[PDB]
mmCIF file of C-alpha atoms in Angstrom:
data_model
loop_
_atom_site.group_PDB
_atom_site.id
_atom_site.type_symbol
_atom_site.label_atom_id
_atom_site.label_comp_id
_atom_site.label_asym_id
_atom_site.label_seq_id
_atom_site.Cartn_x
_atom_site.Cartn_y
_atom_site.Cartn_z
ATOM 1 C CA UNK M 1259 -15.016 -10.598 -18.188
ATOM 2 C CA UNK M 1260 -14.971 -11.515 -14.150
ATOM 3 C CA UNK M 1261 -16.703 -10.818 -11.604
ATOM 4 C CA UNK M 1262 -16.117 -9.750 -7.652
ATOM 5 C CA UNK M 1263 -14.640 -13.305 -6.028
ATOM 6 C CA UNK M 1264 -11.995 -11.901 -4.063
ATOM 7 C CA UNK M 1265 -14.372 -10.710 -0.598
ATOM 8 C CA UNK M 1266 -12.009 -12.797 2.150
ATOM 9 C CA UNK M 1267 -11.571 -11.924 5.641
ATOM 10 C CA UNK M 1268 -8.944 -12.202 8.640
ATOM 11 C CA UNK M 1269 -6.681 -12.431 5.953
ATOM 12 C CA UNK M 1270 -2.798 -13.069 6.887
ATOM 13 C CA UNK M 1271 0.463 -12.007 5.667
ATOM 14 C CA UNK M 1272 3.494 -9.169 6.386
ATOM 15 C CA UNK M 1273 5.874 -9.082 3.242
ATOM 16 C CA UNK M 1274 4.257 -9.267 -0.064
ATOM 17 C CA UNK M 1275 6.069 -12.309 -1.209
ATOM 18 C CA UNK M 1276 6.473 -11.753 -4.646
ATOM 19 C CA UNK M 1277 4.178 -8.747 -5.492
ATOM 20 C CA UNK M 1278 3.064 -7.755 -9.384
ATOM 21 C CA UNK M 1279 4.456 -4.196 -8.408
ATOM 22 C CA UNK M 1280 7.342 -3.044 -7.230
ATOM 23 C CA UNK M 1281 9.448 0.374 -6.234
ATOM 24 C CA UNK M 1282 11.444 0.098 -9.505
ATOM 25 C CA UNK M 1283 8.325 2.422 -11.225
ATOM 26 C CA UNK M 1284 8.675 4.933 -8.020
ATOM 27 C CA UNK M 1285 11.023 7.805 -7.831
ATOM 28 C CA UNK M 1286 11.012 10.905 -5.924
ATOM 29 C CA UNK M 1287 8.755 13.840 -6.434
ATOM 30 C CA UNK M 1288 6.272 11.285 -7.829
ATOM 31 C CA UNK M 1289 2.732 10.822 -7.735
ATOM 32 C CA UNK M 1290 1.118 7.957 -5.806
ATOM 33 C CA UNK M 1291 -2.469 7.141 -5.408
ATOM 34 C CA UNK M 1292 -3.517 6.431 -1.686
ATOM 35 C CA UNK M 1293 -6.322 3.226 -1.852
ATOM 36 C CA UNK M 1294 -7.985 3.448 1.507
ATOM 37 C CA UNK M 1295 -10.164 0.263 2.666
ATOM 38 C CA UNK M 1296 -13.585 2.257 2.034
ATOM 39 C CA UNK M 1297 -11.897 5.778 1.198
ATOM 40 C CA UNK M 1298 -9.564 7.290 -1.700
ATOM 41 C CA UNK M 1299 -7.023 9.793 -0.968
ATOM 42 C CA UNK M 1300 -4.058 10.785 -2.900
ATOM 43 C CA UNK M 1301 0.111 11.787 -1.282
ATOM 44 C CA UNK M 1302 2.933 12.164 -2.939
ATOM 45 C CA UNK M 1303 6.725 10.681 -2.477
ATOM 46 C CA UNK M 1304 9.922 12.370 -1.233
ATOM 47 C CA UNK M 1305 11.820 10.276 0.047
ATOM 48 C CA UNK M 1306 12.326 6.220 -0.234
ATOM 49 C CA UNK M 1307 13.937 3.696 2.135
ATOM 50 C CA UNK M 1308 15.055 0.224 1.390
ATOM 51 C CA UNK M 1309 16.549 -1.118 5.127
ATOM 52 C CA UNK M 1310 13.074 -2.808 5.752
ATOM 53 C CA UNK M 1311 11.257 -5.786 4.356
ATOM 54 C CA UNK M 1312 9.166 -4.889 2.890
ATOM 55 C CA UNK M 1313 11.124 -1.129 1.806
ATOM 56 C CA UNK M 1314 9.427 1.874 3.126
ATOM 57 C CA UNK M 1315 8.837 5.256 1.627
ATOM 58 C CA UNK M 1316 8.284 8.725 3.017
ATOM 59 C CA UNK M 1317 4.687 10.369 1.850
ATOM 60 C CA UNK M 1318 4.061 13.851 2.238
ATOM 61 C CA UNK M 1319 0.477 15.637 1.730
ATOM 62 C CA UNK M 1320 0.046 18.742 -0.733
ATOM 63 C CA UNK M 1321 -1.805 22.102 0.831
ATOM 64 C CA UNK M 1322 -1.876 20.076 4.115
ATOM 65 C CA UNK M 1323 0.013 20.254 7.766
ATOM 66 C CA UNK M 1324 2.947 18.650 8.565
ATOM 67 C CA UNK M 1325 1.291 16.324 10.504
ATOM 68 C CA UNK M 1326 0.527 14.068 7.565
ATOM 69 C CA UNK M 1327 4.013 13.991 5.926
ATOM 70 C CA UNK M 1328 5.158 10.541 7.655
ATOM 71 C CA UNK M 1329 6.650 7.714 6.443
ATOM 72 C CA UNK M 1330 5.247 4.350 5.587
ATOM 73 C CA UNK M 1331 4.929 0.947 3.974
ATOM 74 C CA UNK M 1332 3.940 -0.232 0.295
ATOM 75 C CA UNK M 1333 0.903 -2.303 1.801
ATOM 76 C CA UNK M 1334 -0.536 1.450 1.695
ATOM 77 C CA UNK M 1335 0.866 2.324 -1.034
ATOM 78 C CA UNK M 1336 -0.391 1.185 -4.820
ATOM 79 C CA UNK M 1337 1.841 1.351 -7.919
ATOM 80 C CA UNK M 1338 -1.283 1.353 -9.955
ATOM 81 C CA UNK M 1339 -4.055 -1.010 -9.052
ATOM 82 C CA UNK M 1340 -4.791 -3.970 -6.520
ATOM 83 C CA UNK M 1341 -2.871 -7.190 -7.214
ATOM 84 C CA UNK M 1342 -5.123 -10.697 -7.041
ATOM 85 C CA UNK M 1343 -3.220 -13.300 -6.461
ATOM 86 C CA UNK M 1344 -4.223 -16.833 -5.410
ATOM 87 C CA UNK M 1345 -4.981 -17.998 -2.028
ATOM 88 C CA UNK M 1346 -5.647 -21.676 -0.045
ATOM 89 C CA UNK M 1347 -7.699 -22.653 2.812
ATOM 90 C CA UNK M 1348 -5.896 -23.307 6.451
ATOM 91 C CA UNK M 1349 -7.802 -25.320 9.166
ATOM 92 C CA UNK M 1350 -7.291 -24.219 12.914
ATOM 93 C CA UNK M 1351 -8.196 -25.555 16.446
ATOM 94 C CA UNK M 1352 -8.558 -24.097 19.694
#
């Protein structure tokens, strides 16, 4: 087994370069699983966009306003679970 030795801050990075998931397992209608930082909450896909980089797709709450139904990223978005990947050390200077 492992334990908990991924607990990094002010960590940097836009586009997933080379994620474990992808949109290829998301189509519309679907199910997806909303991960919040120190919350869980669930939406649901309509529609999906692929101008951006990363792609963005449209999530839309169920018995909820309208208010909620946005769009937004994949960074919020989890195909199933959280994706570890490896990491190095910068240095910096004021």
């Amino acid at each position: 087994m492992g334990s908990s030795h991924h607990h990094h801050h002010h960590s940097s990075g836009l586009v997933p370069r080379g994620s474990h998931m992808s949109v290829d397992d998301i189509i519309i209608k679907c199910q997806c699983w909303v991960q919040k930082n120190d919350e869980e909450r669930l939406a649901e896909i309509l529609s999906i966009n692929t101008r951006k980089a990363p792609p963005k797709f449209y999530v839309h709450y169920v018995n909820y306003n309208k208010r909620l139904d946005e769009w937004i990223t994949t960074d919020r978005i989890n195909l199933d679970k959280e994706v570890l990947y490896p990491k190095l050390k910068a240095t910096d200077e004021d």
